Amino acid sequence: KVFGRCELAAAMKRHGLDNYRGYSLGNWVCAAKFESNFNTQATNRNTDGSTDYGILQINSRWWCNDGRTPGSRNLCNIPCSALLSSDITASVNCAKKIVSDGNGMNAWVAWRNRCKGTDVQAWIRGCRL
Ligand SMILES: CC(=O)N[C@@H]1[C@@H](O)[C@H](O[C@@H]2O[C@H](CO)[C@@H](O[C@@H]3O[C@H](CO)[C@@H](O)[C@H](O)[C@H]3NC(C)=O)[C@H](O)[C@H]2NC(C)=O)[C@@H](CO)O[C@H]1O
């Protein structure tokens, strides 16, 4: 599923990401935009053999199990395919663990390089939120 910007903003807010760990909703929408282009089915292979999955490109080395990532933990205790569903619940629960693990949203390279420090409220502009 390719979410619309406001559709994803409302889903993320409903799933409790708005201001989670102090990150405003615009940060999460921005991160999803640059990580996956709002595509729940986005998958991207890393050079170390892990894969990034879903709307928030959650990595299989630490957070989910894909059965092909040597040295992996499954700290979200979930199949990585469950991070590709049209329902982002699993991605949000896992993202909540990720952003609470110590380095905040710097866990998302696209967020750090493209969202951090920018006017992230633009990502929720016009949404009935
Ligand atoms: C969205 C996503 O999956 N991003 C991936 C990153 O999570 C990953 O970076 C590594 O993440 C782990 C888990 O947060 C980091 O571990 C934590 O590190 C801090 C110290 O920096 C420590 O306080 C935490 O206890 C520790 N947590 C655990 C569970 O051990 C780790 O430092 C990150 N490593 C690097 C090199 O950034 C990167 C790289 O694998 O991939 C992203 O896709």
Instruction: State how far the Cα of 66 lies from the Cα of 68, in Å rounded to an integer.
Output: 6
Data resolution in angstroms: 2.3
Q: Cβ(71) to ligand 1 under 6 A?
A: no
Q: What is the CATH number of domain 1-129?
A: 1.10.530.10
Strands (E), 55-96: 58-59
Distances (CA, A) of 14 to 10, 54, 83, 105: 6, 18, 17, 19
Neighbours of 82 (CB within 10 A): 18
Domain regions of the chain by residue span:
1-129
Torsion sign (Cα): 80, 100, 120, 93: positive
**Which of 62, 69, 116, when mutated, tests ligand 1's pocket best, judged by the most ligand atoms within 8 Å of its CB?**
62
Q: How was this structure determined?
A: electron diffraction
Q: Do residues 78 and 64 touch, judged by C-beta distance below 8 A? A: yes
In b/e form, how buried is each residue of 92-113, taking b as 16+ CB within 10 angstroms? bbbbbebbeeeebbebbebbee
In the chain, how long is the greatest CA-to-CA distance? 44
Nearest-atom number in ligand 1 for the CA of 102 is 23
Task: With CA atoms as reference, report the closest residue to 108 among 39, 57, 45, 43.
Answer: 57
Q: Cβ(107) to ligand 1 under 6 A?
A: yes
Write out the two tokens for 85.
């569903």
Provide the 3-class DSSP secondary structure of residue 126.
coil
